[model samples]
Target: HHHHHHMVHITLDRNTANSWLIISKDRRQVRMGDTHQNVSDNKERFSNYPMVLGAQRFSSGKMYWEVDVTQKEAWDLGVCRDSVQRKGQFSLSPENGFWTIWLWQDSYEAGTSPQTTLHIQVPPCQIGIFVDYEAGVVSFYNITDHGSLIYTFSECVFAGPLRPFFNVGFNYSGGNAAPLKLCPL
Candidate 1:
């Protein structure tokens, strides 16, 4: 078994972002836009969800990336299948091609069937998402303590390609103003 952690850097895909989601010029960061932009309906663009996709996809490998959530109070970060739908509001559960964890109204939880609550003494300022495709495992970490385990989804059968996903939930009020930043490894 290889114990060496492999780092993967991923940037947000601007074309996949919703009009209300502001993406950085470098496409490495995303946040809720203060005002929505005028955009035409496209297949890749999200019609309802305030989310975006990563510019890259992974098939089989150990992949890891981190999102800086320091300035935001609520957000979602994880990996989603390339087959995930981009239109309308839908369940964010793993069965729906989304295996993610999120924070909302000071509560943290995994986007599971019943939504598993995550109990942590302090909110994580930086969240690391790690995935082992062949192992069918997706894990999340709080990067403060050199990557403390926050949650893990095992036996995650990846039927197709997977890509990094980020979301600044619809309601951006209550200190959810900052962008979800993709930091360098």
Candidate 2:
């Protein structure tokens, strides 16, 4: 039963939790950490989509990121920014909170690069953020936040991967470390 609609499902429990870095069907985990830890704190089903580092680079335009957080009330934090310049981040949180999943955005445009915009309007039903790589577009959505029509950014050729913060070396500072010990299937 092979489906082409991009349907991937895996149960993330404590026992099989750490294995997320080793096994996956569609995506490859660039970093290995506790993505399920976010859901565990809220009594929700834990889930995360992996991303490879080769192609998931964001610098200029708009993008789309989707995560189904219907089970619990959790915030989503996205980490995809310039490897050098670190600033210009906007989110609906208090005082640049760290590790706090607040529905917000981070973007910048230095040269004549394409102007990107990422707007989220999912609702209080799901938790996820969209990212625009080319023009650095960012959008925030709460499945049940506002109304039914809350799209924040314009859709375009969003080129990048859904990489995690731990994998980008942004947390450790000036070092590339493979968190997940993965092999080709």
Per residue, candidate 2 scores C-alpha lDDT tens digits across 20-64 of 333334443334343333422222212232222223444444434
Model 1 residue 97 lDDT?
92
Stretches of model 2 off by over 4 angstroms after superposition: 1-23, 28-55, 73-75, 82-123, 132-137, 144-185
What are the clashing pairs of model 1?
none
lDDT of each: 0.84, 0.31
* Cα lDDT tens digits for candidate 1, 1-185: 22226888687888889889888788887878777777666799988878999999999989888888886767788999998999877988888998999998889999999899997776788888889999999998887766678899999977999999888876545567778888887
Candidate 1 achieves a global lDDT of 0.84
Give residue 33's lDDT in candidate 2 (0 to 100): 41
Worst 10 residues of 1 by lDDT: 1-10
TM-score, prediction 2: 0.32
